[PDB]
């Protein structure tokens, strides 16, 4: 019996971009979800398939903590059944998703006066991403019928686009650290139970 490292996932100094979102597997620990509420009031705390009031009473098999920084106007796209740029080309949640989407503003940590180009997102791709699919490709995407052959021609663009992330931006453009907890609710085994 020991406390799960949810605090270490939340308080991480350097977060990953949305096209290369990190994944941490939580196992063999006491899933005390009460430590989540120690942070500031979240911008979005929508839960699916479970209730946020009794997470410490249920027991889960696999607990995946997905961490990625997105734009404020794009937080609504991380939800089962949404459609958008981030939902199709960066992070696609399954329709039968079971978990909570936790997002909070991080304009003081992820922004810089001269621009913060460390965070990037995928502007366009060939097809939509499957649920929980990560694509770290950086090859030049061709838009016209003629092959680009890896150069930025008249109709050839880079697949990734960098975020601005300046502190003077609006609330819809400020960075938001999103932690998506994926819960496999006791399918075959019983491994990660809450405090009892």
């Amino acid at each position, epitope marked *: 019996t020991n406390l799960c490292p949810f605090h270490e996932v939340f308080n991480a100094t350097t977060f990953a971009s949305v096209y290369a979102w990190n994944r941490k597997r939580i196992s063999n620990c006491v899933a005390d979800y009460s430590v989540i509420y120690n942070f*500031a*009031p*979240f*911008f979005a705390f929508k839960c699916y398939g479970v209730s946020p009031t009794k997470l410490n009473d249920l027991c889960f098999t696999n607990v995946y903590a997905d961490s990625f920084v997105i734009r404020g106007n794009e937080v609504s796209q991380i939800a089962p059944g949404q459609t958008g740029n981030i939902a199709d080309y960066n992070y696609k949640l399954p329709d039968d998703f079971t978990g909570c989407v936790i997002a*909070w*503003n991080s*304009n*003081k940590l992820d*922004s810089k*006066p*001269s621009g913060n180009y460390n965070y990037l997102y995928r502007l366009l791709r060939k097809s939509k991403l499957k649920p929980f699919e990560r694509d770290i490709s950086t090859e030049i995407y061709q838009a016209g019928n003629k092959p680009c052959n890896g150069v930025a021609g008249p109709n050839c663009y880079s697949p990734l686009q960098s975020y601005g992330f*300046r*502190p*003077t*931006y*609006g*609330v*819809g*453009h400020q960075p938001y650290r999103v932690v998506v907890l994926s819960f496999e609710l006791l399918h075959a085994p019983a491994t990660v139970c809450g405090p009892k």
Partner: antibody
Amino acid sequence: QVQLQESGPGLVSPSQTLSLTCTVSGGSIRNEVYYWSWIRQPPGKGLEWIGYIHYSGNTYYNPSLKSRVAISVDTSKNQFSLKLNSVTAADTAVYYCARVSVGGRLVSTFDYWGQGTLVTVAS
Amino acid sequence: EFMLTQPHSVSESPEMTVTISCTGSSGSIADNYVQWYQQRPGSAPTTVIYENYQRPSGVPNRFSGSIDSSSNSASLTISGLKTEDEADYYCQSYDNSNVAVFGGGTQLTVLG
């Protein structure tokens, strides 16, 4: 409508902590305007920005007053307070509290201001 | 720092054109929005021009703002000056580090 009103001790002894509470009516400290600032103005001088606070704990203070200015948010009472410790003789000013609009592309629109209160710093 | 500088005082006959200068000592005035507030003697400031070209409801058409990126400065032109417009005007902008900066204030005086 949205109205702001300042409150607190009208006189603070020197070297003490100046504490003023701004009560907002018609709107909570929430997704409404996302910002709540403090502005002071000495008699016969221009305005001076102190700092604004976000409902998610984000604080942005003036570089010349970063060490002394401490702003706290209390969403349960729709009141945000300003704490200015180690007051000096030059801190005599009318402290206003005004909301700032952030829903646009960038921060702007100091739309609604308060009536302000003159807090002297002499014993 | 983004210390804006305004003229200390300006005076002109009524019904004429009056321009208030707002020069940026550093940074860029085009990176952030410029707002103008009118603070009459013994009152709270009121927004006159925001987003550098937008005027809220209730403000007369006599107030209009413009941006001059070639001189990294802004200007507030007044069309048809009258008695009720005699007040203090502060131009406000934002530094790149989320620091809001106000101007020094321009004392308008109706000479007529």
